[PDB]
Design a protein around this ligand. Structure first.
Ligand SMILES: [Ca+2]
Ligand SMILES: [Ca+2]
Length: 279
């Protein structure tokens, strides 16, 4: 398959070079995988989700995304026009409030929820969780992410937007999950992206167009936008049978574009997520 005039990040993950405009991908498109978007929720009625999204848990008064952020992230995972894995099933877990905030106790509960809830879903090609969230270092938050991974879920987490070492942020700093930095369309590390030895991979995160609440779309930026590129890419590769929940991060790293990025600090990986699709 080939989506012309795609969002630049979609084009970028299917090219060895920046500046292309077509997203080339296998038509299997993540069918048979499942991705949990642990965030502010998902506006599952958005036309772009085509009935493939649903809310499965909320920690607030409503299951509605009153923010947009979780809808955006879910769009980059799996919407028709904006998504990496355009036929995956999406599951919404609302652990963040409508201002985008949440307490670590809630975030932890949400992760343990996914670990159990996946055992009651039919996800024959495997299960991924996308966590575009975090704050300062917490060993309990890291332990929760490690448990989620251990349970058989491909966990992708944002590196954080502090232009600092991700060692001091959670769940970014949990070594066993996949920690995602952000890049821009000119293959620079994004100005706000965290860095550090704990990063596994970079994905597109500056000026990312996706779905928004009220059946709308917009462009926003952050390691939160990079993370769902990786999570959708994992689901895509798991449906193709190339990798498993346990091995996907390492697979993506090993098959990344290497050495493409600028302003990567020594000791941080120079690796950009890449689907290695050949028609
Ligand atoms: Ca290159
Ligand atoms: Ca890691």
């Amino acid at each position: 398959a080939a989506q012309t005039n795609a969002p630049w990040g979609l084009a970028r993950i299917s090219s060895t070079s920046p500046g292309t405009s077509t997203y080339y991908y296998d038509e299997s498109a993540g069918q048979g995988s499942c991705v949990y978007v642990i965030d502010t929720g998902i506006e599952a009625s958005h036309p772009e989700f085509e009935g493939r999204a649903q809310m499965v848990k909320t920690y607030y008064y409503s299951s509605r995304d009153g923010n947009g952020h979780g809808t955006h992230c879910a769009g980059t995972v799996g919407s028709r026009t904006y998504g990496v894995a355009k036929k995956t099933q999406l599951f919404g877990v609302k652990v963040l409030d409508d201002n985008g905030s949440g307490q670590y106790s809630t975030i932890i509960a949400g992760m343990d929820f996914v670990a159990s809830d996946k055992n009651n879903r039919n996800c024959p090609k495997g299960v991924v969780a996308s966590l575009s969230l975090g704050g300062g270092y917490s060993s309990s938050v890291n332990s929760a992410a490690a448990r989620l991974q251990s349970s058989g879920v491909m966990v992708a987490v944002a590196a954080g937007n502090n232009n600092a070492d991700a060692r001091n942020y959670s769940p970014a700093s949990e070594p066993s999950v996949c920690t995602v930095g952000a890049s821009d369309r000119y293959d620079r590390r994004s100005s706000f992206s965290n860095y550090g030895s704990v990063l596994d991979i970079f994905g597109p995160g500056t000026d990312i167009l996706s779905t928004w609440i009220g059946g709308s779309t917009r462009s926003i930026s952050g390691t939160s936008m990079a993370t769902p590129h990786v999570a959708g890419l994992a689901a895509y590769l798991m449906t193709l049978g190339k990798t498993t929940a346990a091995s996907a991060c390492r697979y993506i790293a090993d098959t990344a574009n290497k050495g493409d990025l600028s302003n990567i600090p020594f000791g941080t990986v120079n690796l950009l997520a890449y689907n290695n699709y050949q028609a």
